[PDB]
Design an enzyme around this catalytic site. Structure first.
Site, PDB file in Angstrom:
ATOM      1  N   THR A  28      31.204  13.633 -22.286  1.00 23.02           N
ATOM      2  CA  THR A  28      30.964  12.168 -22.308  1.00 23.02           C
ATOM      3  C   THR A  28      31.731  11.843 -23.625  1.00 23.02           C
ATOM      4  O   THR A  28      32.518  10.623 -23.389  1.00 23.02           O
ATOM      5  CB  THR A  28      29.226  11.982 -22.962  1.00 23.02           C
ATOM      6  OG1 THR A  28      28.758  12.562 -21.826  1.00 23.02           O
ATOM      7  CG2 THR A  28      28.958  10.592 -23.229  1.00 23.02           C
ATOM      8  N   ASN A  73      32.302  18.312 -29.215  1.00 29.20           N
ATOM      9  CA  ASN A  73      31.245  17.974 -30.088  1.00 29.20           C
ATOM     10  C   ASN A  73      31.034  18.808 -31.322  1.00 29.20           C
ATOM     11  O   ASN A  73      30.922  18.149 -32.208  1.00 29.20           O
ATOM     12  CB  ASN A  73      29.949  18.098 -29.450  1.00 29.20           C
ATOM     13  CG  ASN A  73      29.649  17.332 -27.996  1.00 29.20           C
ATOM     14  OD1 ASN A  73      29.914  17.416 -27.051  1.00 29.20           O
ATOM     15  ND2 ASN A  73      29.161  16.132 -28.370  1.00 29.20           N
ATOM     16  N   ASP A  88      56.618  22.021 -29.746  1.00 26.29           N
ATOM     17  CA  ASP A  88      55.741  21.555 -30.602  1.00 26.29           C
ATOM     18  C   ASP A  88      54.152  20.826 -29.816  1.00 26.29           C
ATOM     19  O   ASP A  88      53.129  20.564 -30.301  1.00 26.29           O
ATOM     20  CB  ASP A  88      55.975  20.462 -31.481  1.00 26.29           C
ATOM     21  CG  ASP A  88      56.466  19.283 -30.999  1.00 26.29           C
ATOM     22  OD1 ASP A  88      56.876  19.082 -29.889  1.00 26.29           O
ATOM     23  OD2 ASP A  88      55.966  18.023 -31.643  1.00 26.29           O
ATOM     24  N   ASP A 105      61.197  16.940 -27.372  1.00 25.96           N
ATOM     25  CA  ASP A 105      61.477  17.460 -28.734  1.00 25.96           C
ATOM     26  C   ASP A 105      62.884  16.963 -29.329  1.00 25.96           C
ATOM     27  O   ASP A 105      63.850  16.582 -28.342  1.00 25.96           O
ATOM     28  CB  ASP A 105      61.685  18.979 -28.467  1.00 25.96           C
ATOM     29  CG  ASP A 105      60.223  19.787 -28.504  1.00 25.96           C
ATOM     30  OD1 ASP A 105      59.194  19.131 -28.513  1.00 25.96           O
ATOM     31  OD2 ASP A 105      60.371  21.284 -28.411  1.00 25.96           O
TER      32      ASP A 105
HETATM   33 CA   LIG Z   1      57.474  17.791 -28.551  1.00 23.45          CA
HETATM   34 ZN   LIG Z   2      28.896  11.226 -19.861  1.00 16.76          ZN
HETATM   35 ZN   LIG Z   3      26.007  15.481 -19.609  1.00 17.79          ZN
END
Ligand SMILES: [Ca+2]
Ligand SMILES: [Zn+2]
Ligand SMILES: [Zn+2]
Ligand SMILES: O=C(O)CCN1C(=O)[C@@H]2Cc3c(n(Cc4ccc(F)cc4)c4ccccc34)CN2C1=O
Ligand SMILES: O=C(O)CCN1C(=O)[C@@H]2Cc3c(n(Cc4ccc(F)cc4)c4ccccc34)CN2C1=O
Ligand SMILES: *[C@@H]1O[C@H](CO)[C@@H](O[C@@H]2O[C@H](CO)[C@@H](O)[C@H](O)[C@H]2NC(C)=O)[C@H](O)[C@H]1NC(C)=O
Ligand code: NA
Ligand code: NA
Length: 750
Positions: free
Chosen positions: A149, A170, A632, A638
């Site tokens: 989400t 999260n 990188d 690059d």
């Molecule tokens: Ca790069």
């Molecule tokens: Zn969601």
């Molecule tokens: Zn969910």
């Protein structure tokens, strides 16, 4: 007290909607602001009314003026109709009351609204169906990896990949501080979201956030309420959010019969929205976006792989579980911890293994999931329908998988005065919305990963005029400048020559069978273009010098002999050459590139077998191939600074990937080299790896595994432009916005 300051946009007792979350509301907020009385609907008897303060909404003659009417009032007691009952009337021009400077935008967002619910819900979501059908819409909209989400909502709002806006999950571990952060304040994160962008440019925004105990019906009245305020207060952009249908989806699974009510209920709120706008004469004036953060898959407890079945010491790792895995040492001074060992341990150890491990830099580039230090090096892509846990019910639905997966696709509908009428547009990526929402609000969008122009076909008006970027380095055109003896070694350009968008030195080289741009810096081509129409030899270890390019800036066969790891291959393949005379062009040293032996097996299969199949299938193909350097892992070409590895004792840099862009006519009755219309294109970015650990059947014939790896690393053209600093398709017969759309296309194989 909140008196009549209630639900305000701006030390004291607090009246804004987000107050209930911070537990800073005035004691009377639940009495004045959150009234629930009589319900959310009028009835025959309610009409002719005491404007009773005790109620949730009113059915008095006062009603309309004060701007706090129940959304079905007109329908019930002035004879008018439900908006879902009206026929689509086109809106050729914003119909706003006097003193509106611009059409308002209302973003109606819904958590976990999978694209399939549009077909398998037509019957149960009529208001949403009427938005879809009368407005502009796509079959689906693609979210970002990870399909969670917060990462998706913030991309939606900012236009940025999670790697760049910084909400990569999260919980996130920061190794700079050695602390973990659990997720909300917009302001500590990357990018400029929409509500800010609008604010900085003198356009007032409403909240994009609500306090969860504020019910959906109240949020709608609140938005309609705000829309009747006076010009100096009234915001131009608003946002509704629903935790449904994600909430029920986790509990019942996306195909559970329990899903039916929650969608009906979401549709009711979308009904009240429209019935409400209509009774304020705003239904042909506001633009609505109905949009989703991601989808939902069937996932149950018993489909769970466990790391303890692969790893010796699983108590030495920390794993973020679920539909993606992120692995990290749990202990700081543990010398026993070895990432190479862990990955090996997790690599094709069962025939039906339900995840694949990857260091983040080896994840397919389309995911854009690497350039952030809170992305743990070791990542597990989990097979759709499955989970991953550390070691050994609630749920039957989840998400967070690979965003090319279907169950993860989501919805987009655009209704309003600025959107096209009854138009169906192709599927796009939700990173493109930020740019469009700015367009609907007259804003200059902040730099994002969208491609401004690519979605102009969604809009009636308000399209912005994108311009081709400028070449930064003009090409060289050497002629026959050297003698064979100076060297110590050992039609095909249909869509324009691509344009080099950085400072460097390159020679453009021509041959019968192909055209190339040779970097005198990187010692190889930047790009090699060649058309193959629908319709071998024992010279394997011979290469010839290219007389148009000085031996200083050419590769040699000594470096490849003295490198026991590395080998070489050709971008234009000898196998496809048009004649014995022409075959010698394919063996020019200007066509060689560095290629591990393992990568060749993929690459030879591709050049020898798939191209001619693709040509048969598509009626010709143009093929542009080149190398990519991204050590990188930030998704961008690059500089020489960033190059970590070279062919043994030379300056030849080794590419991290190899791209191809395969182009044809949409009308496959016209050959590839004689189009009159739209183009068809598919591209890929293949990682350049010493081994084929990623493909579980690499010990078999390439017919049984190469083509699966390729599908996995499908890429947008735009992806390759970022990674190579080139610009393709500059001289076509199509409009530049159409070409931007072509470039944002990713050919998924589902
Ligand atoms: Ca790069
Ligand atoms: Zn969601
Ligand atoms: Zn969910
Ligand atoms: O310049 C530098 O490198 C360090 C300076 N610096 C900051 O001042 C802000 C402070 C802050 C950040 N975030 C986002 C964040 C999320 C997860 C993490 F593991 C680390 C940071 C917050 C969230 C809530 C409350 C405050 C903050 C990011 N910041 C910095 O890196
Ligand atoms: O009301 C509820 O059921 C719960 C309260 N709640 C939320 O859980 C989400 C969290 C969230 C929101 N937004 C803003 C937003 C809205 C629509 C969009 F198209 C894009 C962004 C975010 C932006 C970044 C990261 C997280 C979020 C809106 N939310 C809530 O009001
Ligand atoms: C995605 O978009 C962001 C913003 O346009 C790009 O990130 C910027 O990169 C420049 C140059 O590397 C930095 O100076 C900025 O600080 C970055 N901005 C932010 C907000 O992170 C990023 O390169 C784009 N990514 C891709 C793959 O195109
Ligand atoms: Na070799
Ligand atoms: Na293998």
């Amino acid at each position: 007290s909140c008196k009549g300051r209630c639900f305000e946009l701006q030390p004291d007792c607090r009246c804004d909607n987000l107050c209930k979350s911070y537990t800073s509301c005035c004691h009377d907020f639940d009495e004045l602001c959150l009234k629930t009385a009589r319900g959310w609907e009028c009835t025959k008897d309610r009409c002719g009314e005491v404007r009773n303060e005790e109620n949730a909404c009113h059915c008095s003659e006062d009603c309309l003026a004060r701007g706090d009417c129940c959304t079905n009032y007109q329908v019930v007691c002035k004879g008018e109709s439900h908006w879902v009952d009206d026929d689509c009337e086109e809106i050729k021009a914003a119909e706003c009351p006097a003193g509106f400077v611009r059409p308002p935008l209302i973003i109606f967002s819904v958590d976990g609204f999978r694209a399939s619910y549009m077909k398998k819900g037509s019957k149960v979501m009529p208001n949403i169906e009427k938005l879809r059908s009368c407005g502009t819409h796509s079959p689906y909209m693609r979210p970002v990896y990870p399909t969670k989400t917060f990462p998706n909502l913030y991309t939606l709002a900012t236009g940025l990949y999670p790697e760049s806006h910084g909400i990569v999950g999260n919980s996130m571990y920061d190794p700079v501080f050695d602390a973990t952060f659990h997720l909300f304040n917009h302001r500590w994160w990357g990018g400029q979201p929409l509500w800010i962008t609008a604010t900085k440019q003198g356009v007032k925004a409403g909240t994009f956030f609500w306090s969860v105990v504020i019910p959906h019906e109240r949020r709608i009245l609140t938005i309609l309420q705000w829309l009747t305020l006076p010009d100096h207060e009234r915001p131009s952009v608003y946002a509704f959010y629903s935790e449904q249908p994600d909430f029920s989806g986790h509990k019942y699974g996306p195909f559970g019969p329990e899903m039916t009510n929650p969608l009906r209920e979401i549709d009711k709120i979308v009904g009240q929205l429209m019935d409400g706008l209509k009774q304020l004469k705003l239904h042909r004036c506001v633009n609505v976006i109905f949009v989703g953060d991601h989808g939902m898959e069937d996932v149950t407890c018993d489909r769970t792989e466990f790391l303890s079945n692969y790893l010796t010491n699983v108590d030495d790792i920390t794993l973020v579980p679920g539909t993606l895995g992120r692995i990290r040492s749990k202990f700081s001074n543990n010398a026993k911890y070895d990432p190479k060992a862990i990955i090996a341990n997790l690599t094709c150890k069962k025939p039906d293994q339900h995840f694949k491990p990857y260091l983040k830099q080896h994840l397919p580039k389309r995911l854009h999931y690497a350039n952030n230090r809170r992305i743990e090096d070791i990542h597990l892509l989990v097979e759709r329908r499955w989970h991953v846990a550390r070691k050994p019910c609630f749920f039957q639905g989840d998400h967070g998988f690979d965003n090319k997966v279907n169950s993860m696709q989501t919805v987009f509908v655009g209704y309003g005065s600025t959107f096209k009428y009854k138009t169906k547009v192709p599927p796009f990526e939700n990173i493109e919305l930020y740019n469009v929402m700015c367009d609907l609000l007259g804003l200059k969008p902040a730099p994002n990963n969208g491609t401004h122009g690519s979605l102009n076909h969604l809009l009636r008006t308000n399209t912005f005029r994108p311009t081709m970027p400028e070449e930064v380095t003009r090409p060289n055109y050497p002629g026959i400048m050297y003698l064979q003896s100076d060297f110590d070694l050992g039609r095909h350009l249909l869509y324009g020559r691509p344009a080099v968008l950085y400072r460097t030195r390159y020679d453009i080289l021509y041959h019968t069978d192909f055209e190339s741009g040779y970097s005198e810096i990187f010692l190889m081509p930047l790009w090699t273009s060649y058309t193959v129409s629908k319709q071998p030899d024992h010279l394997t270890s011979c290469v010839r010098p290219d007389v148009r390019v000085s031996p200083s800036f050419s590769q040699n066969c000594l470096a490849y002999k003295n490198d026991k790891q590395m080998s070489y291959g050709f971008l234009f393949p000898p196998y496809l050459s048009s004649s014995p005379e022409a075959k010698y062009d394919a063996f020019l040293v200007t066509n060689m590139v560095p290629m591990y032996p393992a990568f060749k097996r993929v690459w030879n299969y591709f050049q020898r077998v798939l191209v001619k199949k693709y040509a048969s299938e598509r009626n010709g193909v143009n093929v542009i191939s080149g190398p990519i350097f991204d050590y990188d892992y930030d998704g961008l070409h690059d500089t020489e600074d960033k190059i970590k590895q070279y062919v043994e004792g030379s300056s030849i840099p080794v590419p991290t990937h190899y791209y191809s862009i395969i182009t044809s006519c949409l009308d496959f009755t016209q050959p590839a080299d004689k189009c009159d219309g739209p183009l068809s294109v598919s591209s890929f970015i293949l990682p350049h790896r010493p081994d084929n650990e990623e493909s579980c059947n690499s010990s078999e014939d390439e017919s049984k595994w190469v083509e699966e790896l390729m599908k996995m690393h499908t890429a947008r053209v735009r992806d390759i432009e970022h990674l190579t600093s080139l610009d393709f398709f500059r001289k076509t017969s199509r409009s530049y916005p159409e070409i931007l759309t072509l470039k944002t296309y990713l050919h998924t194989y589902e």
